Amino acid sequence: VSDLPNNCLNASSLKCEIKGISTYNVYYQVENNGVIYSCVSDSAEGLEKCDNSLNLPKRFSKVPVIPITKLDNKRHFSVGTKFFISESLTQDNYPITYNSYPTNGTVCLQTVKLSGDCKITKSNFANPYTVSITSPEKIMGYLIKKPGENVEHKVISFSGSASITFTEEMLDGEHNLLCGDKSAKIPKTN
Amino acid sequence: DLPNNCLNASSLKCEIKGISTYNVYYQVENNGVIYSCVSDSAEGLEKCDNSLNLPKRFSKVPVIPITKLDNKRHFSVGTKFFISESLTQDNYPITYNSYPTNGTVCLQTVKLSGDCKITKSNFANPYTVSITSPEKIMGYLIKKPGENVEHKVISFSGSASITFTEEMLDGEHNLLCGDKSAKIPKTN
Ligand SMILES: *[C@@H]1O[C@H](CO)[C@@H](O[C@@H]2O[C@H](CO)[C@@H](O)[C@H](O)[C@H]2NC(C)=O)[C@H](O)[C@H]1NC(C)=O
Ligand SMILES: *[C@@H]1O[C@H](CO)[C@@H](O[C@@H]2O[C@H](CO)[C@@H](O)[C@H](O)[C@H]2NC(C)=O)[C@H](O)[C@H]1NC(C)=O
Ligand SMILES: *[C@@H]1O[C@H](CO)[C@@H](O)[C@H](O)[C@H]1NC(C)=O
Ligand SMILES: *[C@@H]1O[C@H](CO)[C@@H](O)[C@H](O)[C@H]1NC(C)=O
């Protein structure tokens, strides 16, 4: 029971400090016996007493996201930010634990986009403004977004299948339905 | 200007800050002010400090950061620089491939990306497969998990014929192409 990564787990038992809050995970370090451990988690549990825990959300959405690498489709696909492990630019890779995985590296904060398999179809059952989204993965996210908006905390998580009926404000020619790695233009009403 | 001083290292005091497998991160000085820079073009940087291992060309196959640390050993094809956000809310101006922005530079272990289909065509050599891809350029590599093979990645357009070597026929090498991986079988 080698418990190196465990130090990040009991943080209800240690002096803790949040260093950063992203849309989908938290960046914090904890002290034990004078040694500092860096941690990244997608779970907000037990971090209430940490310093800088003021804006710690109720829970984190667990939808699959990946970094946006082409900067010009940032406005289109952005759904917030997340913390990632990366390599040090000065080779000072320090020990750090990511979602209870021990590793070496540093912390990167990056704007992210939805990802994963999501099937989009137009439904027979209601109307051309009702769509069905399905996914073989445990959790899949979708977001309806006009480019440039800040609707980052409106990612909806679903398991297996869901149905959406577009509102009228969405039925201009500028709203896109983002689901997993997919983007589909939402039609104009008339 | 935002990209001007930075597409202009040949005439200025340049300094390379890092060289990844697929691009270079440098900075330039003009009239006393420093400008950060990220380019996948090696040209014009010869005069920069720390230029010894600056390659002739950077491969331009699409690559994206590995987000699940577990399957790093299997898919890794080197490292690349990317723009990120300041953790301390101090975002400075950077030019990425002549695209100007605010942010921070990140260095991330990277994997192959894009659409690639592994179809084993009927040929005369048992060890020859055909790969297809609709993208303008696509990349592939033969590696065994953990193999430190970077700069062994191959560009191709439309299609390509891969003729396996002997060593690759241990059941431990994978055909990485785009976002696809396939296991090279044991044959005797
Ligand atoms: C992270 O890096 C450390 C080294 O800083 C690795 O831990 C061992 O550290 C000793 C120093 O006492 C080195 O001599 C060893 O080479 C390292 N062990 C091994 C097996 O490589 C550690 O393994 C690295 N990875 C993780 C997940 O901690
Ligand atoms: C993001 O980048 C823009 C680039 O135009 C910044 O805008 C100006 O940047 C120059 C230096 O690059 C400063 O001297 C100006 O004071 C900036 N402000 C304006 C209004 O032009 C901008 O400050 C950067 N940051 C943000 C949050 O947009
Ligand atoms: C660490 O402490 C937490 C309670 O804050 C508990 O969930 C966990 O089981 C503890 N682990 C060990 C090894 O004591
Ligand atoms: C960059 O360098 C050239 C070198 O002749 C210089 O004249 C000018 O400042 C810049 N030119 C361009 C096209 O950016």
From TrEMBL, chain B:
Signal peptide: none annotated. It is found in: Host Golgi apparatus membrane; Host endoplasmic reticulum membrane; Virion membrane. Coiled coil: none annotated. Belongs to the tospovirus envelope glycoprotein family. Heterodimer with Glycoprotein N. Interacts with nucleoprotein. Forms the spikes present at the surface of the virion together with Glycoprotein N. They are able to attach the virion to a cell receptor and to promote fusion of membranes after endocytosis of the virion. Probable class II fusion protein. This is Envelopment polyprotein. The gene is Gn/Gc. The chain holds residues 109 to 296 of 1135 of the full protein.
